[PDB]
Paper text:
However, in the post-step 3 structures of LIG1/3′-rA:T and 3′-rG:C, the 3′-OH terminus attacks the 5′-PO4 terminus downstream of the nick DNA and a phosphodiester bond is formed. The overlay of the pre- and post-step 3 structures of 3′-rA:T and 3′-rG:C demonstrated the difference in the position of AMP as well as in the distance between 3′-OH and 5′-PO4 ends of nick, which were measured to be 3.7 versus 1.6 Å (3′-rA:T) and 3.8 versus 1.6 Å (3′-rG:C) in the pre- versus post-step 3 structures. When we compared the density for AMP in the pre- versus post-step 3 structures of 3′-rA:T and 3′-rG:C, the omit Fo-Fc maps at 3σ of the AMP moiety shows good density for almost all the atoms in the AMP in the pre-step 3 structures while only sparse density is observed in the post-step 3 structures. This suggests that the AMP is released which occurs after the formation of a phosphodiester bond between DNA ends. In the post-step 3 structures of 3′-rA:T and 3′-rG:C, E621 residue shifted closer by ∼1 Å toward the 5′-PO4 (+1G) of the nick that is sealed through a phosphodiester bond formation. The sidechain rotation by 24.5° was observed at R573 in the post-step 3 structure of LIG1/3′-rG:C as well. The distance between the amine group of K568 and the ether group of ribose sugar in AMP was calculated to be 2.8 and 1.2 Å in the post-step 3 structures of 3′-rA:T and 3′-rG:C, respectively. There was a shift in K568, R573, K744, and E621 in the post-step 3 structures of 3′-rA:T and 3′-rG:C, which would clash all over with AMP. Because of this, we suggest that E621 may reposition after phosphodiester bond formation to facilitate AMP release. In addition, the amino acids in the LIG1 step 3 structures of 3′-rA:T and 3′-rG:C clash with the AMP, suggesting that the AMP in our structures is mostly released.
Human DNA ligase 1 (LIG1) is the main replicative ligase that seals Okazaki fragments during nuclear replication and finalizes DNA repair pathways by joining DNA ends of the broken strand breaks in the three steps of the ligation reaction. ATP-dependent human DNA ligases, DNA ligase I, IIIα, and IV, share a conserved core architecture consisting of the oligonucleotide binding domain (OBD) and the adenylation (AdD) domains, and catalyze the conserved ligation reaction involving three consecutive chemical steps: the formation of the DNA ligase-adenylate intermediate (LIG-AMP) in step 1, subsequent transfer of AMP moiety to the 5′-PO4 end of the nick (DNA-AMP) in step 2, and final phosphodiester bond formation coupled to AMP release in step 3. Here, we determined X-ray structures of LIG1/3′-RNA-DNA hybrids and captured the ligase during pre- and post-step 3 the ligation reaction. For LIG1 crystallization, we used the EE/AA mutant that harbors E346A and E592A mutations, resulting in the ablation of the high-fidelity site (referred to as MgHiFi site), which has been utilized in previous LIG1 structures with non-canonical substrates.
Numbering used by the authors: 261 to 385, 392 to 906
Write the structure that this text describes.
Amino acid sequence: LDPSGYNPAKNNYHPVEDACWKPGQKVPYLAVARTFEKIEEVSARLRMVETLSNLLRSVVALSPPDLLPVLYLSLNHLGPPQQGLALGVGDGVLLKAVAQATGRQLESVRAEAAEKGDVGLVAENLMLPPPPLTASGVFSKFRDIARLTGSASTAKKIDIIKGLFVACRHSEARFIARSLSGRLRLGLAEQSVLAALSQAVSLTPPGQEFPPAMVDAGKGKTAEARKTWLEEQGMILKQTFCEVPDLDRIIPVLLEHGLERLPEHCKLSPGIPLKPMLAHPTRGISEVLKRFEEAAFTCEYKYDGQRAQIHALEGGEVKIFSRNQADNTGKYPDIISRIPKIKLPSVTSFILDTEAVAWDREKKQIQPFQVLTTRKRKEVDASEIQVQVCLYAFDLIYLNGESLVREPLSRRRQLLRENFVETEGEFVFATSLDTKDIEQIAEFLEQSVKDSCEGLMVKTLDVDATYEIAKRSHNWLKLKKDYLDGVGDTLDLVVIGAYLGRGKRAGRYGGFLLASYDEDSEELQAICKLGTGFSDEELEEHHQSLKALVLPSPRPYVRIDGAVIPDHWLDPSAVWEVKCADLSLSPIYPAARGLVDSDKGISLRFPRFIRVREDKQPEQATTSAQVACLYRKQSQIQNQ
DNA sequence: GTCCGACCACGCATCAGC
């Protein structure tokens, strides 16, 4: 009846009764918006999952076809990752449509949303009432916005955004703007959406003619029996979605065959991307041999490049996907021509887990990550390429029809070495080492950096050595040089500027501008920005103490060049200790400019805050000459 | 430990404005 009072967070929620739309009718967007309200209101994940599941239950029973747009709207996605659909809507475009729709000045709303940290609050705060917004239609308008390209397309995107804002009632304007800005801020993402959908199709099975005979399949169960039944049902959907992270493929099959029979039809196959195996960072060599004590592990290098899933289809078709299931086949014409040189004549199909690293041919050495990012993406010709790549395969998932996900790593490494041939500077296995004692491990870790690598990989060989990422999504372990305490390029830099925070950091500063001391010019040269490493209490100690140091104008001895203008200029007085992974040749920052490259400065890779240095003063800080020394001291730069 | 969302540098790709 009235969707304004729709409460999906009600005890003993009845899917057909407590809903707010008649069967056969389309799901109104206000129902999705009121549920977002009930989800952001709480902080318990088990509470959000149940609230979202209460909507999904009403969807599969009243409007089954609207299930896919509801899931995508909840995920704030536009489709499968390999589709490549992107909104192309910046903040300035969204703020332009907000002030245009509500009749306000651009400078009034641009300064507004900056102080709030959330555009949804500005949009919500004359014309005849338009028809209510539908969930599927709103999702179809998001795709319509993303498909617009070419000249005058930005203008065309603004009319569509304006059309939704003039039709938004109650709370819909808050969440439309949040979705269009890519910051839904629900505390609910892919893992909770999957659990809420697995719970909905189990409690209210789909494919059930009105009247729904089973609205709560957990009625005749003990409390322990229901939590166990919903958990095993959830892992069926989680593992299937891990081999096919595609909702456009799973939901139609799930609607017709149920959750239990879903693996029998949604199976891992070449050409369909799969979610890659991730690695968990660990402190030192002791935490490695502790969590992995009762299991023999291998130790492979960690290469600084781009992860590349090489799918080989029956018939020669080759597709390369990225870590986020994005199509990168047009990125590597140079690879698709070198496929036969890596597989034996008996290999008819495979899925390889490799890492693309920029390779120099004349020097026969590895190039830094910046050189790899200079490749042209898009759809290059093999003649116009310039930055060469060398594959470092470290896993095998699919081979000649059979899938290798349920096999230990020791088995996959055997088939990978037997059915594939190495090529120096083209295809070579990740340098591995099966070792248990700490002496060779610490020596192998230093050998990786000497051979221009980030660190070492730790993976079990038998015990929990499967590729089922649904059980342990971070079963692998990272061991970089910057993780070990007492080692790593630590710098004592000065804060000069600070940026207003957004979302979780709204009302505070979310970032800070850091500078190094150029003694020759007697200037403070901005080196990087810093927005991670602080504790929430430490960020308040910084938000208050630095608030007495705000300057209306930058000091004359400050030099930031093409860096982002800080929202607040600060009196240089605070010296902070900052840990970083690497030193990069910056095209934007002026720190140590001219000391290494004639046209570029130096910035920090992965900078994070460590500790305030109250004893040190701005003059007693890391010099630009010191910064230039650390750059040439780096291994990847020394090997060049 | 899991999950989520704050934030970092860099460089190709795109488009409003000229």
